[PDB]
Design a protein around this ligand. Structure first.
Ligand SMILES: O[C@@H](c1ccccc1)[C@H]1CCCN1
Ligand SMILES: O[C@H](c1ccccc1)[C@@H]1CCCN1
Length: 155
């Protein structure tokens, strides 16, 4: 079904994350963490405090695809377990979908906060307007390995 997914996304904010390599997205998928540049870290911390869900939608540059999406479970924090990224604070994230979506499937979605360009277009950290972001997340193939019960309880 899609009902719990729609519930998690209700009144959410959405941000495009552009990564330079699959290895870092793989690490994020395995460890449930993300780290970004200071300008985006500040924006995400602000969004985390005000919105009931903040959703990161990931895309590896030149892949032509999104690799999935996740919900922030914390603000950024320093001093924790180190992460062997491929070269700020660390956000904890809960994955909602670890399956890919090709850009060809989102060609009908425009992002008002980026001049109504197709939603695949955007710098790392670009905010995606609510309706566009909701519809983008609903386009991903269902990830039947995920149980959103525990995510709902964190809201
Ligand atoms: O956001 C990126 C970045 C690039 C340069 C300086 C700080 C942060 C990368 C780093 C690991 C995962 N995300
Ligand atoms: O998407 C809409 C928009 C965005 C930018 C210019 C005109 C119209 C509005 C914005 C808030 C709610 N929806």
């Amino acid at each position: 079904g899609t009902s719990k997914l729609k519930y998690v996304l209700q009144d959410a904010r959405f941000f495009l994350i552009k990564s330079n390599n699959h290895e870092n997205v793989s690490l994020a998928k395995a460890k449930g963490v993300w780290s970004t540049l200071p300008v985006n870290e500040k924006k995400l911390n602000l969004a985390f405090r005000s919105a009931r869900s903040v959703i990161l939608i990931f895309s590896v540059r030149e892949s032509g695809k999104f690799q999935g999406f996740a919900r922030l479970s914390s603000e950024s924090h320093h001093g924790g377990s180190p992460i062997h990224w491929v070269l700020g604070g660390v956000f904890k994230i809960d994955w909602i979908c670890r399956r890919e979506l090709p850009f060809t499937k989102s060609a009908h979605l425009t992002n008002p906060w980026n001049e109504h360009k197709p939603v695949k277009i955007g710098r790392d950290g670009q905010e995606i307007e609510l309706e566009c972001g909701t519809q983008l997340c609903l386009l991903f193939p269902p990830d039947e390995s995920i149980d959103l019960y525990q995510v709902i309880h964190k809201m």
